[PDB]
């Protein structure tokens, strides 16, 4: 079965993600007119205070919160649950592969860093660990109303039915223009409010989900 | 060509000298005090209001700015010390508001975030002062402005100091109306509840964002409706996000929660069609050859002893290189050419009292910097302006007036940094606050008053001795000490960096070492605007 | 052609009605009180300091302005009521300074005269506020500026409130440096003794004048020389007129006495090569058909009763003619076209709360006035902004925001006059102080606050009744009266014309009748500048 | 930064649904019909005239444009369907002329080639219409213009419709005279025989090319010389290439044959000193995530059923990404921000009748696109403008007028594409032909009329029923059918894409799939000109 990641392995995943974001920043700068300028160094240098980034990584089924403090010398202090790790490292290339060079609490290591859509792959000489980046709700979300004031030609569904998203619920004609309603939502219909041949108005609810 | 070698500034200081140890210890004490004070100001309104802020699903405002800017980007906060002991029993951290410059989607944006944990996000007069300062920073530098609206009404018993004047609260909407006519994009993100005057801040935006079940806009609150009409209405039924996105049309984007609103903000900024163009010339950057804990040791805390300002310019420029202009004529002013982070800088600094030769050298250097379109960095360490009968006979007044005219007419991005004292009309000549620099930071040892405490105490002692000798009474040593303690005490208290930065007289007490990085950040924002041609007035010859 | 006949405004009021008698009596009482207060402010620092001012051969400052301007010319004083009960035991008449607009050698000049009879001519913070207001009036309107320098040092225990900020004392020299780069001529007449910060006011002038045995300029006084050096020197030996005209070269003309200095000032102004050019169109002037003691009877003192604003526009325009624009749609705002003294004016006035139809009508009218380059006169009589659930559902916020954007982006010479109440954000929509009008006068019945006293008292009464009914304690009538007396008292005291005009929030309480003449004078100065093309921002549709 | 992930549009349609099969089959039938019609138009004047064109050593005109442009370059032909059944028995393929945009020596040039195989290359009135359209496309977009002159005289019995008016034939020379004053280079290549009015087309060129024994220029032909004088002269002896290159001086380069003339044309274009500068910002290009045979299935042929316009915007933009502006307020108009081929586009599309909220959203979006200098792509699928008594009471007229004013004042490169119906005054609001877009293409299912056929038939049926019921006669079903068949028939015939594109009301019926590529090509030519600042008129609030 799959085994849980060690806290040091989560530090490596967090560091690889941070350095990948830096890489994107660096390749943006290479195309900029304003070259050599500050803001291009992903140092997290706040004025008079420190910056702590709170990120969450998903280890299998469970979420782990990692608080990453940006240190003045380029190191990171990553606190995972309670334990603080001193995390340093960088990226280097050998041919067409990218490697992540780490030092965590004085322990040096090297692993291949591949980030594909959401999953962070770390390939080392002791195994292979897959850490997932959680996807926020507003990127994964993708009842209905009447478009105008018209008469309904054909109903489709009743209570007790089930439709899946992108389904015909109703067709209504409003000043000679056939409008087929569809479902952005999902589930099971609890009530259909307008039977076929009745007059529905503008922004009037047609069906309902309980 | 750009290849030949050039001598550099800098002297390795005597690290074993007891003057170095005492100066280093006292400046380190000042910087540690600064550190612990800003770590107390960072928490905001305290743990009770932070619990009631996170219990409604709201991100805390520093977390909002952390999730808004590019990942790993440095944030330049402005005026972190506003409202510090400015009101009697009212502790207002940060003024109630968090303003700074950050990097959003590759664009340097100016961010204005209402901290709602401090007295409901209500507007104090210093909050309005800090906000209008941020908005003219955005207008001078052409920075797109982002507001994170979470208000709680203007404060009532201070209402005079907030409402009617020219630079009171309504000026804010003036600043959004003018900046929209100039293509400086204004985004408002309604994360809270702006009410009845603050509802113009989302309504005057070029592109707006609102949050469901959390963000309310109305010109009249439910107390005002219940008093004037008698109709009970809630907040979300009156001015909620569904009502404004769907029926009224005030909001332009709709957001599920706070993270969605900041994501949508980054989208709106990415589709602004803005491309940064530098008109100055850039060289590949370098580093100073001397560290800045040496600036702790060099500069120190006592203002009686002088130092060399060149040992500051060795510590903050690229390569420690410095082309000194007119180096022997009037060496109480040090003017030269350097580079910070690639940008060409004309550096003007002090070394003593200002003779007329120093003012002539300063006027010549400011004219060179405006003819070649080079920015100017002024470093203030002023005692005064060289008293004497002979010097007033020479016309020392018209030479200081020439420096003031050339400094005030200059169109290049000027940045002032007060590394020591800043007293009197020399403060006007070296581009103080009233002469519109881009940014004005100070060090934690600075003093700024109309004169020094000893000058005021001693001229008042001599004048009162002169009038009593015309009178005849005995003016003893104890009468002189009772005359000299409250003048010194008042000019010491009200000349502090914390007294000056509790208002928005300066853009923030900065660490000496961080000085280098901070100047680079400042200059980067100031190069977001094209440089206009300078035309001076009449030089009083 | 311009010959055909046109109907006119105006209704003869019921002069026998007891409402007219009571309104007339109460407004006459207000105007008589204004008269006696300004006759006390006119004397200045009192007879002792006036005797010691005339014992040195010095003209008194009002006599200086009387001998400076053209013979018989009207003088428009600005902010006569500054410093009125603004400091605790310190009575500062006129702020210490006399600023106004006059006609010198045929040119409208802006005159700034240091009254030396009031605390030695020392600069109070309100003196700096009044002076910087005068200087931006001169810069907006392109008026040549004349200073009559008689100073006594900046005030010491208020030094913070005078020295460091952006709009503190040093801004003055910024304003003379920028205005000299724009060909706006600056004349300083040293009639007194400017000292050590004020000596930049003569030194930064394009052409200077000094008086023998009476006028001293130095950057350092004889106390400072006697303290720093130990050399006893007088005032005239150190910085006298002979030393400055002959050796140092600070002064450009030399004057025997005060009359010679004012004569030389008129010569310097005559040789400025300035020729006034109007870009607006002028018609031959006329008179109102109704007198303005009728404005005493119409308007009165109570703000509860409304009146018609058209009966004001019949009393102040030429011929009582008024082309009313969009007269039925949203008649809580009255917008039309008239002429004062030949000048074309677009008049915007109030008649009640501001519905959304009123804001749309206002935005349309301001766009017409900026497309045709017509000046704008705003008349403020505001209660509020029409509370209700339906009106917030309609988007009443975005309509007020459209009026604020069009008012703030407008480049025509705008003049505000507050003929009644001016409360809240409607004050921002009708071009209040923060939206940069040219001049802003008020009537002696006006009130200006963030809300009315009754609104604040009643919404606080209803909110505290809400929270106690959630609590459970008894909130009686006596608790409500003890809740309602200090709110009403504070909003009545701090909403006064004398409280608002003790600061420089407004350019002066004017008589109602004199209103007509005053507006003409104001508009004449505002036409000394060419009119720029207006470009608006984004209209939130 | 530009690195974070963003959601995208697009829904995979139900490919098994019988609606999809029927819509796909009917749109495929329309596109195949388009294909075979343009393959018949491509041959030109037929094989007899093509044999007599190649027997004189002349390249055919499509071979001329194939050898003129860069190798492998896409050619964008404009108005391939002009003259389609426009004259009674006269079949005029392509109008007689071949106009398009191509890439010559790295420069986007506009090419105008006289097809001499179709009625001797004579000018029909539609030929003049097509040519003047091409020339204003070259002037709007600053494209250098190349003419391949092979004329046969203006047509005589249509001479009125060709000669005198403003936009008749002589306007051509006006267009070459104005464009030469603006540095838009005009090259004429005389490959044929321009005669007596067309001889100004080579003579007004900035640099000219002629072909020996093949190219003749004269202001008077040998019939006119033989009639007026009686001197027999040939064509080559009168106005040949040797006479014009050697004695008269009309031609500037001399060419052996057709290939030499096209080679010399490419030389002349290479030495124009033109360097393209983009002022917009570019991102690295991408692809749509959904193919466009899905646009066949989605859109279909029937105009009764609606579709989602967002499923079109998923199919034509880069990455299928689309930042939707004001997504809930008035969702009968879809406005958002996207990118095509790197270029930033502001996309405005329809989804139904236009309420007042839709017009307000449209006015706001066009103001955003002109403030940020972003191009605009309008997609027209209009039924009408929402009839009703309440909506006329709301002022639906002034909101449509605001959208028309902001669309007409806009200076950004606008491109219209009519993906469905386009009826009535909504056609004016969504930037139809009379509002000067850069290019206006249509799809083969579009309809364009002053109203729909059913609207005209039904309002005429109800009006005639209303007047007969005032009269008294019987208006039966058969009288109604005889009333409704010719109105429907006429509005169906004259609303076609082939009826609209037989004139130059649109720049060409394009395939749906090719739509994506075509828009990119169009936008590339439209970015050859710098973008001017937009200033709007008066917004009727
Ligand atoms: C001693 O108590 C201080 C006396 C005056 C201060 C000195 S004198 C020279 C410097 N210039 C100036 O105006 N003040 C400084
Ligand atoms: C009574 O004490 C006053 C209640 C509120 C004041 C009224 S309600 C309508 C006007 N608009 C506004 O905002 N305030 C005024
Ligand atoms: C039926 O034959 C059509 C009647 C009118 C056409 C409809 S009504 C609403 C749409 N708007 C418009 O002006 N015409 C369309």
Residue numbers in the entry:
A (entry chain I): 499 to 640, 648 to 715
B (entry chain J), C (entry chain D), D (entry chain H): 23 to 563
What does the paper say about this structure?
Propionyl-CoA carboxylase (PCC) and 3-methylcrotonyl-CoA carboxylase (MCC) are biotin-dependent carboxylases (BDCs) that catalyze the metabolism of odd-chain fatty acids, cholesterol, and specific amino acids. In contrast, PCC and MCC have their BC, CT, and BCCP domains divided into two chains: the α subunits contain the BC and BCCP domains, with an intermediate BC-CT interaction (BT) domain between them, while the β subunits solely consist of the CT domain. In humans, PCC and MCC catalyze the carboxylation of propionyl-CoA and 3-methylcrotonyl-CoA (MC-CoA), respectively. (**A, B**) The side view (left) and top view (right) of human PCC holoenzyme (PCC-apo) (**A**) and MCC holoenzyme (MCC-apo) (**B**). Both holoenzymes are dodecamers consisting of six α subunits and six β subunits.
The cryo-EM structures of the PCC and MCC holoenzymes alone, referred to as PCC-apo and MCC-apo, were determined at resolutions of 3.02 Å and 2.29 Å, respectively ([Fig figs2], [Fig figs3], A to D and [Fig figs4], A to D, [Table tbls1] and [Table tbls2]). The cryo-EM density of the BC domains in one layer of three MCCα subunits in the MCC-apo structure is missing. To demonstrate the complete structure of MCC holoenzyme, these domains were built into the structure based on the structure of BC domains in the other layer of MCCα subunits ([Fig figs8]). A major difference between the PCC and MCC holoenzymes is that the three α subunits in each layer have no contact in the PCC holoenzyme but interact with each other in the MCC holoenzyme ([Fig fig1], A and B). For human MCC holoenzyme, the covalently linked biotin also binds to an exo-site in the apo structure. The cryo-EM structures of MCC-apo and MCC-ACO reveal that there are two distinct binding sites in the CT domains of human MCC holoenzyme for the covalently linked biotin ([Fig fig4]). In the MCC-apo structure, the biotin binds to a site that is distant from the catalytic residues A447 and G448, thus referred to as the exo-site; while in the MCC-ACO structure, the biotin binds to a site that is closer to A447 and G448 and is therefore referred to as the endo-site ([Fig fig4], [Fig figs10]). The acyl-CoA binding pocket, also formed by the CT-N and CT-C subdomains from two β subunits, switches from an open conformation in the MCC-apo structure to a closed conformation in the MCC-ACO structure ([Fig fig4], C to E), with the major conformational change occurring at two helices (residues 474 to 517) in the CT-C subdomain and one helix (residues 243 to 252) in the CT-N subdomain ([Fig fig4]).
